Design a protein around this ligand. Structure first.
Ligand SMILES: CCCC[C@H](N)P(=O)(O)O
Ligand SMILES: [Mn+2]
Ligand SMILES: [Mn+2]
Ligand code: NA
Length: 261
């Protein structure tokens, strides 16, 4: 659907809150901390200070407030008090908050302690794949072209793109049309129009693209157990580009990307 200026302003607020959760949690992502504790810190912040709510809790039965994925875990990892972070771990914390009826969905990678060269490389390339997609967003561009560009870049940099999960429209609904694939698919044919709001969240594997879903129905891992990284931003298509609604202080791209002169 096409969001009204009123809807978009509410999404700016929700997106900002989701981003602030990631900015807040940063210092706590240290060796020795449990993902369960990280989840509590995030949830307490969302509820007690932001006065919002996690869109994750109860969603299709999801048991926690945020998703925390480590190393070979591709996405939707479930916070656990017994899972401790250690040196070299690459960790994704995926936050989705609902505020004033609208969603803000975003995630970023954190590297614990001493980084490993490939771990840093994978995260760097993954974020750049997201940035490349973001710089392409504007009315007239087809989602298929965006997916194709992400895949071309990721593969050109020696990595692979997960196919089973994708970006998505977002608003009063957590996941709305359309699907935002991060690869070139013949199924995709959506011409972007101003007012559309959706996420871009490429999952990149250091090894092969194949994944495997654990018994809990949420935790997804790389089939070859290679590392997997992901970054996600919620955006709104503007008349001449896009506006990132979940930008953080550490992002190295501006919130508004216009293609004018
Ligand atoms: C509990 C569901 C988590 C959904 C993720 N935020 P995404 O939509 O980025 O995959
Ligand atoms: Mn997310
Ligand atoms: Mn999402
Ligand atoms: Na991972």
């Amino acid at each position: 659907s096409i969001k009204t200026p009123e809807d978009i302003e509410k999404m700016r607020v929700a997106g900002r809150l989701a981003a602030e959760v990631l900015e807040m949690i940063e210092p706590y992502v240290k060796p020795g901390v449990s993902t369960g504790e990280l989840d509590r810190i995030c949830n307490d912040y969302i509820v007690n200070e932001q006065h919002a709510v996690s869109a994750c809790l109860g969603y299709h039965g999801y048991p926690k407030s945020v998703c925390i994925s480590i190393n070979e875990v591709v996405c939707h990892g479930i916070p656990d008090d017994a899972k401790l972070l250690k040196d070299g771990d690459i960790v994704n914390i995926d936050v989705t908050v609902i505020k004033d009826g609208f969603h803000g969905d975003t995630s970023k990678m954190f590297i614990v302690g001493k980084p490993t060269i490939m771990g840093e490389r994978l995260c760097r390339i993954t974020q750049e794949s997201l940035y490349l997609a973001l710089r392409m967003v504007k009315p007239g561009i087809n989602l298929r072209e965006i997916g194709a560009a992400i895949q071309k870049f990721v593969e050109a940099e020696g990595f692979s793109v997960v196919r089973e999960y994708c970006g998505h429209g977002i608003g009063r609904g957590f996941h709305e049309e359309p699907q935002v694939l991060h690869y070139d698919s013949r199924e995709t044919n959506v011409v972007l129009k101003p007012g559309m709001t959706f996420t871009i969240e490429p999952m990149v594997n250091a090894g092969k693209k194949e994944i495997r879903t654990m018994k809990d129905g949420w935790t997804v891992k790389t089939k070859d157990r290679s590392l997997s990284a992901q970054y996600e931003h919620t955006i709104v298509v503007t008349d001449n580009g896009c506006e990132i609604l979940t930008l953080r202080k550490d992002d190295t791209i501006p919130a508004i990307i216009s293609h004018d002169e």
